[PDB]
PDB file of C-alpha atoms in Angstrom:
ATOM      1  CA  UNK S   1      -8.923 -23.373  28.606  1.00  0.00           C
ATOM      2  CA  UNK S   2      -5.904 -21.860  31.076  1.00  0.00           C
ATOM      3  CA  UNK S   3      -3.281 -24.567  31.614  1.00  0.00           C
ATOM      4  CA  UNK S   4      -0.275 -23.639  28.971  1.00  0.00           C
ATOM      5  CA  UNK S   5       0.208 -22.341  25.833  1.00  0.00           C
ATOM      6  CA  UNK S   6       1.300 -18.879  24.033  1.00  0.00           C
ATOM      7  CA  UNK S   7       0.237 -15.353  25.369  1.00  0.00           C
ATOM      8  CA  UNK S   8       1.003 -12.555  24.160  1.00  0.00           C
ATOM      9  CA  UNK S   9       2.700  -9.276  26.059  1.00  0.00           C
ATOM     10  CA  UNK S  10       0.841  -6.657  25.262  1.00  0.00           C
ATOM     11  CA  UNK S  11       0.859  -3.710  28.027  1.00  0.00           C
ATOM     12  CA  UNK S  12       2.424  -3.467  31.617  1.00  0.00           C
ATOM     13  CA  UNK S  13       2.156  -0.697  34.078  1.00  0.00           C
ATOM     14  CA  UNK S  14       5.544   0.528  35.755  1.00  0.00           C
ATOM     15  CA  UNK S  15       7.960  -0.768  33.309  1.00  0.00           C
ATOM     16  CA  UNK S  16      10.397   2.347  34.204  1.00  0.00           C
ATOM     17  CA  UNK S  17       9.519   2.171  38.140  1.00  0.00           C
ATOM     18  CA  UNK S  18       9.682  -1.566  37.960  1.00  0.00           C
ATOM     19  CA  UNK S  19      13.367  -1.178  36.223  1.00  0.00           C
ATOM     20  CA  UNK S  20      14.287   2.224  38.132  1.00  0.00           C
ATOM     21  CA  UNK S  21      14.186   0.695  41.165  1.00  0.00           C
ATOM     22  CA  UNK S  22      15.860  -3.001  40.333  1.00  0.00           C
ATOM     23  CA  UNK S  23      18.720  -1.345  38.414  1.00  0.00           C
ATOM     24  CA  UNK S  24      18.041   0.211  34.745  1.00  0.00           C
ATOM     25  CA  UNK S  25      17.113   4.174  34.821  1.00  0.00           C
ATOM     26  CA  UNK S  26      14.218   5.442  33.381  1.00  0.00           C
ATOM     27  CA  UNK S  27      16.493   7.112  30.657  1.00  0.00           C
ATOM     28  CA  UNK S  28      17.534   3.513  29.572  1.00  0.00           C
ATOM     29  CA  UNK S  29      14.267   2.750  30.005  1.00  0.00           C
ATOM     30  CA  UNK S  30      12.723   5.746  27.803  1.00  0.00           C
ATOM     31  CA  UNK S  31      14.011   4.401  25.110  1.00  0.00           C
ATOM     32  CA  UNK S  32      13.364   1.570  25.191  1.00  0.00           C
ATOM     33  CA  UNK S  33      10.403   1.202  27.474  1.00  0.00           C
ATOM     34  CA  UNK S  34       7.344   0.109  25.315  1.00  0.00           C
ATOM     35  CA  UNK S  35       8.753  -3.357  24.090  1.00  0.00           C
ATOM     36  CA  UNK S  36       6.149  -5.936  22.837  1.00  0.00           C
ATOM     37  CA  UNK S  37       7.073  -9.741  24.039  1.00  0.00           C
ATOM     38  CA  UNK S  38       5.509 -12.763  23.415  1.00  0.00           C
ATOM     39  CA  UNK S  39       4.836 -15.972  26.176  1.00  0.00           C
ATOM     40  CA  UNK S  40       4.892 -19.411  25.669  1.00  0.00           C
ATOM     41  CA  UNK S  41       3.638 -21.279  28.855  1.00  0.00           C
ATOM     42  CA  UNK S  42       3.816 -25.666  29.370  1.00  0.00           C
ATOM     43  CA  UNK S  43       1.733 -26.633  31.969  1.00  0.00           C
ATOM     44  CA  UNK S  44       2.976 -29.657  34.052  1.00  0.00           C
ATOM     45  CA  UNK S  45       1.892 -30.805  37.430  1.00  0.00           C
ATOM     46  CA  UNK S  46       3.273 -27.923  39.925  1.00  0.00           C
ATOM     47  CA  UNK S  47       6.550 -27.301  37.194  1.00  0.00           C
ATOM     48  CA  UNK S  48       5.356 -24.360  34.797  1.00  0.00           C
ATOM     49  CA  UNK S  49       7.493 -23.168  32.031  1.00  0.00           C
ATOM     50  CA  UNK S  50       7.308 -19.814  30.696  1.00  0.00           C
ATOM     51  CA  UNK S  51       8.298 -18.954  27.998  1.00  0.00           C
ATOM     52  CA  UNK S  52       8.941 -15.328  27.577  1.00  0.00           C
ATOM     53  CA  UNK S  53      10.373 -12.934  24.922  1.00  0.00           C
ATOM     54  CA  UNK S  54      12.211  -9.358  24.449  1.00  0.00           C
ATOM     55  CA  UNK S  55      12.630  -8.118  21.278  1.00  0.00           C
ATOM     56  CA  UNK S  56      15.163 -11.090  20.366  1.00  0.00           C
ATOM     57  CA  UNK S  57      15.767 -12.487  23.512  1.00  0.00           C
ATOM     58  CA  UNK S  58      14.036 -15.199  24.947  1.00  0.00           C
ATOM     59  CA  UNK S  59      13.938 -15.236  28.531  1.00  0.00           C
ATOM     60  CA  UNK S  60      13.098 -18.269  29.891  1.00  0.00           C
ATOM     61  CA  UNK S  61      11.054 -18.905  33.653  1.00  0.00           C
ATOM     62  CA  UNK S  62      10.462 -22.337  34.431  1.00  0.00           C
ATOM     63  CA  UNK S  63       9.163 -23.077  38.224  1.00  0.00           C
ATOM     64  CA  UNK S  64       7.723 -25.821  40.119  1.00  0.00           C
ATOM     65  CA  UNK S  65       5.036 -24.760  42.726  1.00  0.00           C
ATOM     66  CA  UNK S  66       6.484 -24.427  45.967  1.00  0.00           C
ATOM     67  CA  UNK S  67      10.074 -24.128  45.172  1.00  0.00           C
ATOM     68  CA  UNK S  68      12.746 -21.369  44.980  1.00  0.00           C
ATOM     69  CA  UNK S  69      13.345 -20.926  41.369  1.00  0.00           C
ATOM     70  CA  UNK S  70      15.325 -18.607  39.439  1.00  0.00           C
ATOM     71  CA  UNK S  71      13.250 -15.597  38.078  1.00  0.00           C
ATOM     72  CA  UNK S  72      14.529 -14.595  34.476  1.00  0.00           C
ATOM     73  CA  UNK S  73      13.521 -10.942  34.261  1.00  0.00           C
ATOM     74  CA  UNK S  74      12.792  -8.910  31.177  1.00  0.00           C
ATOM     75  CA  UNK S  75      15.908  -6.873  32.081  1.00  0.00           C
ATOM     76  CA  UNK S  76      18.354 -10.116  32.410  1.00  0.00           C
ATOM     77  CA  UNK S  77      18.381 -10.661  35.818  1.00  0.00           C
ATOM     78  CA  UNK S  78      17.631 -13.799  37.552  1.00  0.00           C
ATOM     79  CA  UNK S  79      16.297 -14.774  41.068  1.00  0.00           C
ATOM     80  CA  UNK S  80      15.444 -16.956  43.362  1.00  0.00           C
ATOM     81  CA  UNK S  81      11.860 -16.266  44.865  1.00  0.00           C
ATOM     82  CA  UNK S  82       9.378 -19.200  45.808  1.00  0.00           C
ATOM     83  CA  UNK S  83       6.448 -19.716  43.557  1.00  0.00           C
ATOM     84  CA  UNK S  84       3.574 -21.645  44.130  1.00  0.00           C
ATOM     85  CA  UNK S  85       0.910 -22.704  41.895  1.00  0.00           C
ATOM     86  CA  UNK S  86      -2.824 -22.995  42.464  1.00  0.00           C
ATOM     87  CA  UNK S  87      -3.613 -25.631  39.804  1.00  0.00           C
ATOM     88  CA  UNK S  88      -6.304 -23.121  37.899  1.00  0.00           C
ATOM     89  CA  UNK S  89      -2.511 -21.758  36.664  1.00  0.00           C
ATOM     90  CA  UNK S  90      -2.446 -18.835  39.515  1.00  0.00           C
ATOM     91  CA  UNK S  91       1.533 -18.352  40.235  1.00  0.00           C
ATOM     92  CA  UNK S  92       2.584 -16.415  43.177  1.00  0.00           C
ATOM     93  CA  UNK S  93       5.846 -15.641  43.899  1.00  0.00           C
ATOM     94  CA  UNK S  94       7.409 -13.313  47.172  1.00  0.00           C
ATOM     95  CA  UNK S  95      10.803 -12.525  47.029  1.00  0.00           C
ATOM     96  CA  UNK S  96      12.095 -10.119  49.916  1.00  0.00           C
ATOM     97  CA  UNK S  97       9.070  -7.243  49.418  1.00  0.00           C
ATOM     98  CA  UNK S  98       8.731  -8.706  45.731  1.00  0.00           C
ATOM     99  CA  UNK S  99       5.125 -10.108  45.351  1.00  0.00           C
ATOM    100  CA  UNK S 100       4.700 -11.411  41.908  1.00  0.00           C
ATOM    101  CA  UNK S 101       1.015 -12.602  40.679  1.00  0.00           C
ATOM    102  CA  UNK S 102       0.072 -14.602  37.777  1.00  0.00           C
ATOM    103  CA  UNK S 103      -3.669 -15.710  37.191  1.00  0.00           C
ATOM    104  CA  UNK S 104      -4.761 -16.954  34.108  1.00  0.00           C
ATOM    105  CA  UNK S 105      -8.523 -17.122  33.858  1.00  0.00           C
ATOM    106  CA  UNK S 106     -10.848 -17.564  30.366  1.00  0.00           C
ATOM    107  CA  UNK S 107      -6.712 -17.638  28.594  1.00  0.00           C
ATOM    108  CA  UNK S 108      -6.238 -14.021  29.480  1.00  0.00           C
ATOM    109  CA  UNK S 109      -3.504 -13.325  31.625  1.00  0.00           C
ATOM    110  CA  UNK S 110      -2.550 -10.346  34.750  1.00  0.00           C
ATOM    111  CA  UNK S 111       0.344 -10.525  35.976  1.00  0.00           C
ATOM    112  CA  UNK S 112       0.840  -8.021  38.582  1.00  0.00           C
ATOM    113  CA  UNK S 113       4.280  -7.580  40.468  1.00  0.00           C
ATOM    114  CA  UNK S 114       5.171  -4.803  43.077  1.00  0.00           C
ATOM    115  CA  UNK S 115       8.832  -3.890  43.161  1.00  0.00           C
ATOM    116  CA  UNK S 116      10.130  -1.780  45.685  1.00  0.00           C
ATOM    117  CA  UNK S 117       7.210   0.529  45.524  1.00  0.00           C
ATOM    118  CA  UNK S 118       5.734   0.437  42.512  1.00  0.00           C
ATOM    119  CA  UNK S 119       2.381  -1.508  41.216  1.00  0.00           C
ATOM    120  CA  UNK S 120       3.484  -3.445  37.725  1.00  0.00           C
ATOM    121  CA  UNK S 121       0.338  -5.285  36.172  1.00  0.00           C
ATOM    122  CA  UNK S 122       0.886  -6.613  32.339  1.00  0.00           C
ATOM    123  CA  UNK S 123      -1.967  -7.468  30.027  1.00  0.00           C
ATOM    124  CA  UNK S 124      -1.022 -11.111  28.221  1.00  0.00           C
ATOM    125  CA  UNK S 125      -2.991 -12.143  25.246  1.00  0.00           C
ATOM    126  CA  UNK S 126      -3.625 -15.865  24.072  1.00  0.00           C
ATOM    127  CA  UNK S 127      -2.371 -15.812  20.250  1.00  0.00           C
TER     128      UNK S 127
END
């Protein structure tokens, strides 16, 4: 059942486009592009914590529905971008030209984000 709980990073599209354009090259990126994370989610009325990790760095993203929160990135970098929350766990987020989509449906999660110009979607596994 999708509420909460720990999914698993798996795959994402455009994680050299996706850091190209917000600040990291591709080079940085290269080598170290492919990085497996893991995501801890608590589900509380409109407040969602995520909890998400690189390598062995735990970046945090905790929003409530309708709210500018502060986006923890993969990267390090955090912004504010207003989230809101369907209830079924569906988390969408605009920032500037930012869109940011979460849905998790039957615990498997997409989250698909367009940065600048490029189309990110991640594949996130329940453990």
């Amino acid at each position: 059942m999708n509420f909460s709980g720990k999914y698993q990073v798996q795959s994402q599209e455009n994680f050299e486009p996706f850091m190209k354009a917000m600040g990291l090259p591709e080079d940085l990126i290269q080598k170290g592009k492919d990085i497996k994370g893991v995501s801890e989610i608590v589900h509380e009325g409109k407040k969602v914590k995520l909890t998400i990790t690189y390598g062995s760095k735990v970046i945090h993203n905790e929003f409530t529905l309708g709210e500018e929160c502060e986006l923890e990135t993969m990267t390090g970098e955090k912004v504010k971008a207003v989230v809101k929350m369907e209830g079924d766990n569906k988390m969408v987020t605009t920032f500037k030209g930012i869109k940011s989509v979460t849905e998790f449906n039957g615990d498997t999660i997409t989250n698909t984000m367009t940065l600048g110009d490029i189309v990110y979607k991640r594949v996130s596994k329940r453990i």
